[model samples]
Target chain A: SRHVVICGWSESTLECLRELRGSEVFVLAEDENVRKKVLRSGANFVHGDPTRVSDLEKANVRGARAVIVNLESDSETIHCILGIRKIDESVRIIAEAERYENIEQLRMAGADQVISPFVISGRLMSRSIDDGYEAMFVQDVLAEESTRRMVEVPIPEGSKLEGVSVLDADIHDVTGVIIIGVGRGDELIIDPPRDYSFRAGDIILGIGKPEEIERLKNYISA
Target chain B: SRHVVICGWSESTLECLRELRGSEVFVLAEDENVRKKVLRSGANFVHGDPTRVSDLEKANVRGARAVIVNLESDSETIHCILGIRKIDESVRIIAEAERYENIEQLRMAGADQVISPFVISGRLMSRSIDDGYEAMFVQDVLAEESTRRMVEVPIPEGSKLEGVSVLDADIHDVTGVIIIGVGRGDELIIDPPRDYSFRAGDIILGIGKPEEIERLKNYISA
Candidate 1:
């Protein structure tokens, strides 16, 4: 199955798995605790190290829709990313940086994108101090338990929305979902300025209630 | 001066300092290198431990508009927060949780708000995966060097917007500043659905080019 393969376990990885409850989640782990935790969450676990290419091969990197590398250290993450990107370049790879400077290295190592907690925490703190508000709003959105989850529902092949402008898709009119962004292939466009016709394979990033998202899914799929 | 006093030196503190170059910034640093860096950045520095209440007094937390606690340790950060909030309850205090579980402790310690990197990083990675791709979109906004900055422009006493709804302020039409939120006293409201009347001494958070922010400030003040 084309699914999510989370490489490595860290504080962020569990949250990543938890927030991703709706999806089939897999974790590549070397520890029993991690394996049992994944099983407890009703997610799959691969019994191997994420840094090894063989482990990733067993996990079927080529089949995965997305790969998350949340390791204990930045060095290990970069190592894991190199192996994953080496195996499959097209699969979306998201990794982390424990330190700020290592961010560029992770990107250079072929991570599609990288995240740094320090940088993010600093920016959010600044927002609260400078903006005088909006941190709570932002925090709620970023929360693992946030009711508003951002999901990228694909415009599956032979869909009703094929080449139809988002303005015409009536996402707002029917499903009551907000079109926050559009991801066609690997490229992402946020807040489409105009009526962007839905391309054949475009993915619309939306925020809505659970049932509302279901309506969106039904509306977009062929 | 009612300026910013960064409580400690860390990866986020410098970015916080750099992003906050527009304002008068200070650091309560115990090290010579940290003091020199603050001086190099044209910001002030106090030679003292951040956990020391006496050190906070030297930095004048009561007079400061905001205090940032970005300590190397969460324990130290909580201790520092106690000192700052103990002195001034009204001034905004933004602190960090290096560890996730410590976030509540930070809030309980009297920080107006707390930020965590691991949790934020986890959520962002999930979004990039679940939403197809918006991490880059989100990353740019969080970047300290990003051109777009969020500023809370105060409607100083005897200003025009006093009791006038944001709709009537004509911010977007006149100054090219989009009113993203409104901060009244300590309460924050994001995206006012209707014409939210601006009360005197309220702060309006607007996002725009630097010049536009200046224009917004000029327009909002008497």
Candidate 2:
């Protein structure tokens, strides 16, 4: 009976549902139209006010692995979180904060993670203007897959990998991580050739398994 | 001298300043304390109300390359944007919308980009639950560098590289693009081996220069 419970309905909720496809999810809402939308999206729906404990209980919140709250108003979201916590104190709660000032209050109300999408979007848009292509690339990467990720790894001084060519380093043969690009200050060399050698203070941008990436870090540090 | 005019002050403004380091930037604000913070950040500061055209003019808004509006209230942000637009129609305007409903209104009022950070944060937090490590990886990648970026390029049908191992394709030699991972449906093979062969419908994720990425796209499409 363990499942995820999503309280309330909004654009964020819709995206959450999309991410949680094929998982057992129960959606709780008071709006009839929203319930219909949830039902159409192939999720279990419980029609009731999310701020009410009785309504959350009907959705089996006690047996849920986590609860995601994305209500319209900050005060209402805080109230709903409080209500859910009263019934199940241990259920992981993720709440959306309308303003930066409300982030602390949401966390204090027992939300495991408090997200302010507005702040992230504002920063991202600003970056898009400041960095242009680079910011757009990050957005494209995020828009692709949610499993693998690309990251930049800085080569430290006195590291074993320093002064080694891409071919001789055997990074791909060793840790299974691909060195996609290299950066020195503002200059970025994308897909450097095999003869490209590593330099102390140079940052190597690569993508791979998180564990493998850790292996890469160890190799560089060694 | 061309510069970016930042209206109001907040954490996002601080980040923008860090990103725009070495570039001439003018910070417009009414709060005395904020002006001190801006001065400490080493940006030119103009002390006045952002919603007033006379005050913005003092900051050289007419000669600005772009104006970023991050006022405390959506109405104030809209007013500031309108004021900036009235003075110069060609200057790009980026405004933050606290509520989703205000985004359209801000755009209509001549804001070139209307960002709602709260929505982006909410979606990101939701992704954190759905794909924990992957979401964390994205946050790390974004925090790491701004000059380089990760992107996914889909392998088109009948492409020349199809069935060729990553090593055989010699992407780095041909196009200066790195292949960091390969995705088939929802399953992603991070830091895929050099022997990993490309297949139709496969998505190849990598990092590099934007123009080089375009070359890779063309290679796949051709």
Candidate 3:
């Protein structure tokens, strides 16, 4: 089952739960009061200590697609991550860190992506402080409700875009898709140079309207 | 004075302090342990309750450019923002909210920018959950060290390009800039349609290399 399992009952998890309402999500928290809220949010509830192995089993961690850990304390989050990792070796673990120092530790503890919300906030605030208008521009580009959006189209084997020079492809001219960046595995080639060529397995990141993204995806994949 | 005043102590403010290290920053917190860290970060330290007008006055709120509030508690954060607003109506106030319920209250309390760290984190987590690889692409684009960047160029009166249709501008041909969005004032017009035109007082949002952004700005402003 490709479902998401969440741990803890802070505002973080509550909001996370809200974002994941439509999916088959599960919540495990020692606090019983969280049940009323989680159930209302259209998620399943399992009451128990987040760090305990027995409690996690009740939530069916082994079958979960991803386990999101967002406990109040970093230490507890780390402990919960360790417990989940021990039980399920293959499941994706996304954890949150309260302290900046513990981010690396959380990675070692087996959480794949560690989000430091405050650090993120600080960075955003700093961006606003330095380039306030541009930061607003970036926010608008990234916002979901905006008419424009970023689309990532992974070039698969036997795609039409394979081995084509990025400029030769002429995506912008063809379908109004601006090739802003290309993802070569982990790192993205931001604004790939004029000399760069597209390779199979490369993820082409572009900016366009909804129909334009749709057109680009079909063209690239064809 | 174009200096910044930060109120409260938490990992939030600490990261913010580190971000604003080069600027003239003042930190106000009742806790004394923060003094050692704040001073070491090259920011001036002021000791007192963040909600207390006397402590805020000691931080030179009246003369400061902006006051950043990231208290541990939402109540204290709101109260701190209210206190600063009462002290100086002109000084900008940036406050953080722990709970989503208080974001509007924070705005009503007089914070110019209200950042909710958990909500941001939740949105990011949801983005990753839905579009994992695309989310990574966005993170790369938004990251400070990226080779490509987003730039906002505000169209000025008497500029050569004013009233020019967005598609006819030929900005991408002259420079590597790709016009993605336009900001009128409040909300941004994302990926303006081909029929759209640029006007003076409009902010052109584009994505390109550092040099490309520079070229776009100079061309549009000229």
Candidate 4:
């Protein structure tokens, strides 16, 4: 199993760890209380200053496939990224930046990915302000599981089905997944009807079992 | 000077409106309930179905600079795209899709931009789950007044700053903007060092006053 390294032992880390339970995992925590909390998750826990190289090495940073940095301090997190990069150049580092101002700093420090929690949440809150509670239901369908399960299938140029309606497309016949929508140029065709025509360079959104979606994706791509 | 058209009204939208209250804006809603709610937020609210061409035109969709579609139903949202496409193709359409399945469909239907709410929300929720309340503070900074503002700036090709040390980059020195992160290729780099080389196609994330950030961005790009 691939080893996953996680930083901090807060609620977010616990949730992330829960998702990573079956994978080989490493935990880093600065606080003794937090360290104990992480240990309770039944994973390998390292109690030390995560920003230090020696502490990271103790947690076997070089072996990790992915490192999630969820530290509190922006400067300390930057230090952690520098240390982690020295240990493993290839390990993907996903981190959190508390301030939008800190985002650029975090990225420059070598974090493979940096997320600003406020900007994102604010965006979500913006969605709520525009729509009603019903918007949450709309949100569920556009979620992570959906992103993971859905695959984009681009339509071929000059194909006979280039202008055929979505319902009429033999997609379901060739691959059992549902055609949730289509992407044309830079736009999206959400919940289109059967009469929706296929256009060259258009990408189709297919949902079902992963294998089924892959099969349909292959057929469409082919 | 840009006319903001907000579609759908949820708590997230409420927060967005509060943020936008002091700005120039308009709103459209199909339901009377949401319309009333939107009116309370102080924007000029129009009651009409977002999916209908007549309704969109009544809201002066053609003259708007930015149109945010926050509707719930994929069908109605898709129809709204068609309506927007007919009214004016130049307007920036920011659409929200409930499911990944709907993204392509909405895109193909005529949306200029498609955002997955759950995908964004999950990312934020995931951060909060991993880091703690500090994550929330990071979010507050995005809309926080009189503090550092996080802004996204596109990187242009062949700029003087390209291939230069980040610390010495023109914007870093004059704008008071910290290079928090760079979206280089498909990866995100955090806290890049003084010796770290900037390259063309690097999307630099910076923090500073809005005008200062923009001026520096133009200078670097120019």
Candidate 5:
């Protein structure tokens, strides 16, 4: 049985656990509040120190598929990683580093994976100013590094462009977006040319501002 | 010319600026409150929308080696990344994704990197529990998989483990640490064997729980 062992509790951990709840997960925390929090979040609770060999033995570190070292400090995370390695070298270790400078040290300590909070925070703050309301719906796009995000607006009923060629719909002008593709009835037209026309119920993949996208949404209505 | 274009005016950003001001750096923020905070933190400030192309252009995004996008939302962060990509695709866009669900989206939106707050908080909590510390030093460690933490303890005088072989120290249950390496007098040794002898001034690299490591410290002192 592959179980995720989260060594700490926080919002990201909660979210991670929420994503992982479909799977099995066990949480280790000394704080009663955190234990209660993990319990409320629907994760199995193991009350013990994650760094101690005995505590980890109690937590069944050797049985866990992955051990997420979620401690907040650079030094202790390293120590816990070393401790976990001592207990079970086979268990995969995912640790956290507060600063980018400590990334190497954590890696050297035997963490298979590492994540940084400041980097995530800095990037999140940058996104709020980039996208408006549409940003809220783009969760999948945000988590991946290799995907291009274009807004897909639904076509409404009764519009001049309903039956017009997509090229003539003037998607670029209407939405300030380069129409890279269109979707109609389970068929996807990737990289459609100028000759392509718009149809009723067509999903327009528009790349532009929220206002422009909203306007484009209305412009292509049936 | 190395410059820092801070995207937000939060305390975390201020702390970053304060830490950077000892060197040369410039800060940017749209909010008057954030601008004031940045100024108070003793850094030059720029006031403008972080997501707008023109605003970033004015901030000289093209010339910056690294761009720190410290906004509060994933959409805004993505938009900023889009805007940055449009301007300079090479400027290392570090964006923030406040929610775990949004992480994938930010990365997809062309952000070079993304950070999460709850992830940081969680890693800190994890480390605190590991070390049995009452306070957490770094705020965010949740989004990051690996965390960096430090532990400091005074070496007790006349400890048996202080000047013994690394192999023998484990026999007495005094301190069991596979000497990954040792640091003494600015020298570092990696992967020292069990027979590696410990000197009085040598700081051993051992991994164990906070209590276990602390117990090692006590054993050496006892």
Candidate 6:
């Protein structure tokens, strides 16, 4: 089993732990209250300050396949990332930044990926406000448990898909891709009829295997 | 045109402003630097504290369709929500909470939605670590300029789709849903071949219109 070390005891740390259900997780925290919560979650706990090198070593950071730093303070998270990198130069490190400006700084400190949740949430909320029903539908779909993906394929000029009804094109039979909807500029035709003919500049919203979707893209252009 | 009032200037505020390009926007901030930044973004700015009723009124809170509170402190956000609610009882209010514990409090204070950026960022990071390629693909699809949606439909006992092959199911023809993949427990078959048969207990991952997906859900069980 792959071992993962999580630093800090924020809500994000708990969320990360829940997502890593099958992995061997060791949580490091300085607060006694947080340590108690981590122990209750049935995860191994290392009660130590993440900014300290000895504490990181005690948490067996060198052996971890991935290290997640989710401290409340951006500077503290950067310090933690630097310490973890010192312990393991090659282990994947994921760090959370409170401010968007700190994302690059966290990366400079050796974090492979830096996520700013507030920025993402803000973008989501704005989209929801812009188009409530569509945003809610999109979010619901993305939250589904599956390996299938959604993609937007633009119908180029002279493409074979253009001037053909959706049914005659046999998209699914040809490339194993499903056309969910057709996007024509700002308007979207949801569950478009099989007879709905494709037009140049129309963007097809598809869902299928990544490779199959690629095949569909090539076939459409060919 | 719908008008949106955004309080406080942070990275999240900037992201919100960028997403709300088509709307008429007004930004409220007491900090001169933030006010200048908001002005540079070509948004209407009201230089005042959000917690004060007079300041909110100065920003035209009552006339706005939605108001977003993105302050750094949860307590301050709650205060801003209260002030906005006092002025307009029906306008939509979205707030950002620094801590997960404060989400309910912000809601009770009259915020229609409260987002914890840290929690969202944590979930995103975990998903990325679990499957980077799939996560990237899903995010890309969601970011597309259309209204198509993704969904997961479980093959229930005695359902019409239980014995159907991917090719024979005619899912797209009948219900306008594209089967993106098949999920069997922890393993996912991305873009299964057309002849792949559906089985009891298997989950079908698909993409289509929200209403059509609902129709598919009803059709499968019928």
Winner by lDDT:
3
DockQ of each: 0.42, 0.12, 0.36, 0.06, 0.06, 0.18
- Model 1 bad stretches (over 4 Å): A1-9, A20-66, A70-80, A98-105, A144-178, A199-201, A206-222, B21-49, B52-62, B72-75, B98-102, B144-180, B195-222
lDDT of 5 at A25: 79
- Predictions ranked by lDDT, top down? 3, 1, 6, 2, 4, 5
Q: Name the runs in model 2 displaced over 4 angstroms.
A: A1-63, A67-126, A130-222, B127-129, B132-134, B144-222
Quality of model 4 by C-alpha lDDT: 0.63
Candidate 1 residue B169 C-alpha distance from true site, Å: 8.1
| True-vs-predicted CA distance for residue A143, candidate 2, Å | 9.7
Q: RMSD of each candidate?
A: 5.2, 14.5, 5.0, 19.2, 25.9, 14.5
Query: Residue A180 in model 3: shift from native, Å?
Result: 3.7
Q: In candidate 2, what are the lDDT values of residues A1-222, reduced to their tens digit? A: 458888888766766676576259888888888867887878888889999989988888885878889887889999999999999998878777665567779879998766655445445555645223333333333433234446667788877987889889988678767666576753556557779989888877666667778888888886
Which scores better on lDDT, 4 or 5?
A: 4
Residues A150-216, model 1: lDDT tens digits? 5677778776888788667768658866566688766766556456788877877766667778998
Q: What is the interface RMSD of each candidate, in Å?
A: 3.0, 8.3, 3.5, 12.8, 17.3, 8.6
* Poorly placed runs, candidate 5 (over 4 Å): A120-140, A144-222, B1-97, B100-222
Local error of candidate 2 at B101, Å?
A: 3.5
Q: Which sections of candidate 3 miss by over 4 Å?
A: A21-23, A143-148, A153-165, A173-178, A183-189, A193-204, A208-222, B30-42, B47-49, B52-55, B73-79, B97-110, B138-222
Top-TM-score candidate index: 3
In what order do the candidates fall by DockQ, top score first? 1, 3, 6, 2, 5, 4
Task: State which candidate has the highest DockQ.
Answer: 1
Standalone chain B TM-score for every prediction: 0.72, 0.65, 0.80, 0.64, 0.56, 0.61
* Steric clash pairs (candidate 1): none
| lDDT at position A30, candidate 3 | 86
Clashes of each: 0, 6, 0, 62, 83, 0
For model 2, state the Cα shift of residue A31 in Å.
22
